[PDB]
């Protein structure tokens, strides 16, 4: 009988949970494919091994 | 893990977000920005700095 | 692959238009305690004040 105070917290709280998935999806998902570095890694001096 | 409290994992596992990071690093050194603006291209890195 | 003396120059172009959606305003609303918490009630209105 206290009302819908219970649900509003749950539904509102879940919004942040779904929000996090949308945050990461729009940060790292910037390419429509997958790229692999070439086997030989001669880059004219630069070392990317780090 | 207390009462009524729970935690859900991120959308992308760290083992997977590394996949996006690997692709972006692999695509940036082998195709400059060309992969972002269209298909990736073979522009070698030593001259890409130029 | 890679090559010290290699290049890449586009020989053609394609014009593209993309749509970006941005909200600029939301429905403005106003609420009144004198009518919300208490409805045309003298005793309730007196208690509220
Ligand atoms: C990795 O980057 C560094 C940049 O200098 C280089 O690795 C060095 O290689 C020399 C040659 O044996 C070593 O004495 C150094 O200890 C290495 N590290 C550093 C920090 O100097 C190299 O250009 C790149 N390639 C490799 C395989 O390390
Ligand atoms: C690039 O590397 C090749 C090795 O195949 C070398 O012959 C060439 O001289 C290098 N370019 C420059 C500008 O040093
Ligand atoms: C560029 O691409 C368009 C695509 O239809 C084509 O009609 C045009 O002939 C191309 N330009 C050249 C110089 O090939």
Swiss-Prot record, chain A:
Effect on the protein of changing residue 42 to Y: In strain: 19B/501Y, Omicron/BA.1, Omicron/BA.2, Omicron/BA.2.12.1, Omicron/BA.2.75, Omicron/BA.4, Omicron/BA.5, Omicron/BQ.1.1, Omicron/XBB.1.5, Omicron/EG.5.1
Residues linked to a glycan: 47
Function: Precursor of the fusion protein processed in the biosynthesis of the S protein and the formation of virus particle. Mediates fusion of the virion and cellular membranes by functioning as a class I viral fusion protein. Contains two viral fusion peptides that are unmasked after cleavage. The S2/S2' cleavage occurs during virus entry at the cell membrane by host TMPRSS2 or during endocytosis by host CSTL.
Name under which the protein is recorded: Spike protein S2
Species the sequence originates in: Severe acute respiratory syndrome coronavirus 2
Gene that encodes it: S
Residues of the full protein shown: 755 to 804 of 1273
